[PDB]
Design a protein around this ligand. Structure first.
Ligand code: PH7
Ligand code: CL
Length: 564
């Protein structure tokens, strides 16, 4: 019976200026024309989110819980993690990461400046000596762009982000980076989502579904998961980590960060005021993704048992959960789901929207996406992942009319390269603007599984072939429902129909070829679809020449991570 937060009454304030509406760009209109449906969240709506994330939590454990837990620990005891040298940790820090409140920022930290490495060592030392004093944190209102839509009733309030000082963040890396990059797959195997790349996730979902006599799957939407995490859940996560083979120093740092940071602590707004007290999951620490994934999996696996699901397979990504199993008849399936929901609720994890059995894999949404079909060169049936393009396009627009240090369009192109909208619009629109400014060589940052990466457009052809397979460049004969969903979206926002883009694609793939080099390798592989005349595409040379491990190994959302 512990509230997830307590509030002092002080407002959540912003630091920088917050743009609510879309500007007045002319390229932005080349993408979207209904600019009034696009919008960003601001600290103005922060109090509404506060209401939502604030509630009492009731939790009642049971034998199924302890059993699964015990099983997890067993698997964890087979994991050995190392500490990260201050230097190593410092490098995993993002150039733009929020500056330390102790005078010094990201570059200072990244360049191993004296001052920074000093404070960091002090903070570390302090963790080893003090194990109880709650570490201070800052709470801001996130600013993300969405599309207005009355079906839901208007606008979504801003999300909240709770994080500790830069000094602390580096310590987290040192004491837990190896754990959160290895412990997950160790305990849950195939159920751990972040070990898969697009091509792998698709293959995993499809195969699991087809392995069932009569498949039945459901996604579980938890009402504000982070707020449902209890102090006991976080302490349990800690015990799991401790099952690892660690250094005595790492153990003490983990216990201290757990008791002083993870379980809870005071929060101040940007103006340094006492905002409230947190007794749930911090949204902006290193263990957020790892912790939610472990806790979601724990409750869900125990819930499955109370529900008696048959031959069930789980796929967990943070709080995002999808379960596939053998059906026991439609009525039994519904009842089993209501029990699963009852056990989750008991484990302190009720749902927002109630789960519903689904018997069509393509009608299931997990990780904001669904499986769909298309065909390859030899007309072979190819499965891929997609989603409604609305948000991606509203954001793709916004980033065209306003500068964003971290875009999303490029990320979406990487995550959804095989989709119709990605290939024909995003790809087209962006190589267009690039060319009109000569920046095809300039790298830009985008996030993948929460981690930051500096990527160069010129490499998409390889990146893409790696993540989705060569077929991704020749997919055709997309399912009508998918083709319909898109065109429906375009007409809703003001985006020229696929035809207007099929035009530009040639008009663009042209200027790209009459440039050879790398810009050529692209315009050929990425736009082979926009030409009746189709030249044969084969394994790209430097498709292998490039390290891509770090990419799909674990989740780091909210973890302030950067990879090179
Ligand atoms: O922030 C996160 O933690 C994050 C998690 C996440 C979990 C699972 C997932 O599965 C899919 C779903 C569809 C296609 C391929 C894959 Br692998 C994708 C993302 N989002 C991005 O990485 C992300 C990056 C760019 C664009 C959008 C999201
Ligand atoms: Cl269809």
């Amino acid at each position: 019976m512990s509230m997830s937060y307590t509030w002092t009454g002080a407002l959540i304030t912003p630091c920088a200026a917050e743009e609510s509406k879309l500007p007045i760009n002319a390229l932005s209109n080349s993408l979207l024309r209904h600019h009034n449906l696009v919008y960003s969240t601001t600290s103005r709506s922060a109090s509404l989110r506060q209401k939502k994330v604030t509630f009492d939590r009731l939790q009642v454990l049971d034998d199924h819980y302890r059993d699964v837990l015990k099983e997890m620990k067993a698997k964890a005891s087979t994991v050995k993690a190392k500490l990260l040298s201050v230097e190593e940790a410092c490098k995993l820090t993002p150039p733009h990461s929020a500056k330390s409140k102790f005078g010094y920022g990201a570059k200072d930290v990244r360049s191993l400046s004296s001052r920074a490495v000093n404070h960091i060592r002090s903070v570390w030392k302090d963790l080893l000596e003090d194990t109880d004093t709650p570490i201070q944190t800052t709470i801001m209102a996130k600013n993300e762009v969405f599309c207005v839509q009355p079906e839901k009733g208007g606008r979504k309030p801003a999300r909240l982000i709770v994080f500790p000082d830069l000094g602390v963040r580096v310590c987290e890396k040192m004491a837990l980076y190896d754990v959160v990059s290895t412990l997950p797959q160790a305990v849950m195997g195939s159920s751990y989502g972040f070990q898969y790349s697009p091509k792998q996730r698709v293959e995993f979902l499809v195969n699991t579904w087809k392995a069932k006599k009569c498949p039945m799957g459901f996604s579980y939407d938890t009402r504000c998961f982070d707020s449902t995490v209890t102090e006991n859940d976080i302490r349990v996560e800690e015990s799991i980590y401790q099952c690892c083979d660690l250094a005595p120093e790492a153990r003490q740092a983990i216990r201290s960060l757990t008791e002083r940071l993870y379980v809870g602590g005071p929060m101040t707004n940007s103006k340094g005021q006492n905002c409230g007290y947190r007794r749930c999951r911090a949204s902006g620490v290193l263990t957020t993704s790892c912790g939610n994934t472990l806790t979601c999996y724990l409750k869900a696996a125990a819930a499955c048992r109370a529900a008696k699901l048959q031959d069930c397979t789980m796929l967990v990504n943070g709080d995002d959960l999808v379960v596939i199993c053998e059906s026991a008849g439609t009525q039994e399936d519904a009842a089993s789901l209501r029990v699963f929901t009852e056990a989750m609720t008991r484990y302190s994890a009720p749902p927002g929207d109630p789960p519903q059995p689904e018997y069509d894999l393509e009608l299931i949404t997990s990780c904001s996406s669904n499986v769909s079909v298309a065909h390859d060169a030899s007309g072979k049936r190819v499965y891929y992942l997609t989603r409604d393009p609305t948000v991606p396009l509203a954001r793709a627009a916004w980033e065209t009319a306003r500068h964003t240090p971290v875009n999303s369009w490029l990320g979406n192109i990487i995550m959804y390269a095989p989709t119709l909208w990605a290939r024909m619009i995003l790809m087209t629109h962006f190589f267009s603007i690039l060319l009109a400014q000569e920046q095809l060589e300039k790298a830009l940052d985008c996030q993948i599984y929460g981690a930051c990466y500096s990527i160069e457009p010129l490499d998409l052809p390889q990146i893409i072939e790696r993540l989705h397979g060569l077929s991704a460049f020749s997919l055709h004969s997309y399912s009508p429902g998918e083709i319909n969903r898109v065109a429906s979206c375009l007409r809703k926002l003001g985006v020229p129909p696929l035809r207007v883009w099929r035009h530009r694609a040639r008009s663009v793939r042209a200027k790209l070829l009459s440039q050879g080099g790398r810009a050529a390798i692209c315009g050929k592989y990425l736009f082979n679809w926009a030409v009746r005349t189709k030249l044969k595409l084969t394994p790209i040379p430097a498709a292998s020449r490039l390290l891509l491990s770090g990419w799909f190994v674990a989740g780091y959302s909210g973890g302030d991570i950067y990879h090179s």
